Amino acid sequence: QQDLPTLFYSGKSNSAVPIISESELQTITAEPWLEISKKGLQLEGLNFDRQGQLFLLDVFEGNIFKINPETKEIKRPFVSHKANPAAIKIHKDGRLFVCYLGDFKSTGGIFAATENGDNLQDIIEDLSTAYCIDDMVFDSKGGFYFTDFRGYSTNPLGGVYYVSPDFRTVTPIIQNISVANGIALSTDEKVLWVTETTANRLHRIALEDDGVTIQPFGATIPYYFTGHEGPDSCCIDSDDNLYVAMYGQGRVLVFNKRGYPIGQILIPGRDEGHMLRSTHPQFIPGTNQLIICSNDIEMGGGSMLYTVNGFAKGHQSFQFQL
Incomplete structure (x- = not known):
């Protein structure tokens, strides 16, 4: 967690239910972190x-x-x-x-x-x-x-x-x-997030204590994504924010625990059609440093891992519990 572009709890990003459009979201551009290959x-x-x-x-x-x-x-x-x-x-x-x-x-x-x-x-x-x-x-x-x-x-x-x-x-x-496509559990494991790629929708599912039964009217659609192709993989942070990689869009969108957008992370070169295949976000354990992978196959250009600092430290998922 160095001096990389960072997402802060400012403005509408700090509201519980912010009314805002994607173009006005607090936005930052990820920086190159580690090239995996010159090959796509x-x-x-x-x-x-x-x-x-x-x-x-x-x-x-x-x-x-x-x-x-x-x-x-x-x-x-x-x-x-x-x-x-x-x-x-x-x-x-x-x-x-x-x-x-x-x-x-x-x-x-x-x-x-x-x-x-x-x-x-x-x-x-x-x-x-x-x-x-x-x-x-x-x-x-x-x-x-x-x-x-x-x-x-x-x-x-x-x-x-x-x-x-x-x-x-x-x-x-x-x-x-x-x-x-993407899936994630809230910190208390009472909410399940799922991304539906070909319909551009975000699913928020409230689960009963048994973890398999959906609460009455508990499966909703808090957000309709936009753009080709659609939402991909996702992960949460310790504040229960959701980070969703947008496949084919060269970006990652961040939502708060209630499913409202509060942040946006752009991958360099997206405007020219490069690195649009942003497929996965993930935090370096114990830190708020986010890693994002993308590739430039569509234009013959290699595979890269980008990085930025998220709103909070990564979540102690299973592999970190004991």
Whole structure:
């Protein structure tokens, strides 16, 4: 957390229910942090381990990178054996859970492995299930919610599902979503955030204490995004703010706990069409420094990790609890 552009609780960003348009949002431009390659890689799945080391991957080739935020050294522990891996969520026991899309129609799933790619275990099989899992989030009990990345605008085949801590039970939380993409839990785990990419909508779901039942009229749409392509991955901070990467828009939008926009982070070169594939936001553990990955594949230009300081320190998600 150095002297990078920072988001402050000023003006409408400090209001509980600010009435404001995207063009007037407190805005900052992210700075280059670490180039992953001169080559165009579909970077995704940012996630730090208990040691504060950064893990991520590229969807198309399945490479898995481990980065030292301190020295900025890049390592390539292993490669996904499953097609189109999209996210990495680290378990409290140190394992890496990898969500993958497969053929984009039904051969997706989730597998776990060690930091080095050993002990490959199937959490959710690809052929026995019809899921194409794009992301997930662990609750404090070891269970997790994942997004079913399927369908399109008027064909809502997607949805959100909950997997029990023993990975034996899978129960649907909310369905009829045109490609569920990003997902996150509020600090108290009573609210579930989900982004619907092909319909440009943000979902806010109030859950009962059992964590699987939606409160009466608890599933709402606090925000309608705009622009091609749509909302992608997201994460929260300790103040319960939501950071949403906008795929194809070269930006990240930030909302407060009530779902109102309060911040905007732009990726350099977006106006000229560069680095529009901003796919994931993630905080360096114990700090308010946000890391954002994007790539310039669409114009032949490499893969970069950008950074800025968010409103508050990152949240102590599962891999940081004990």
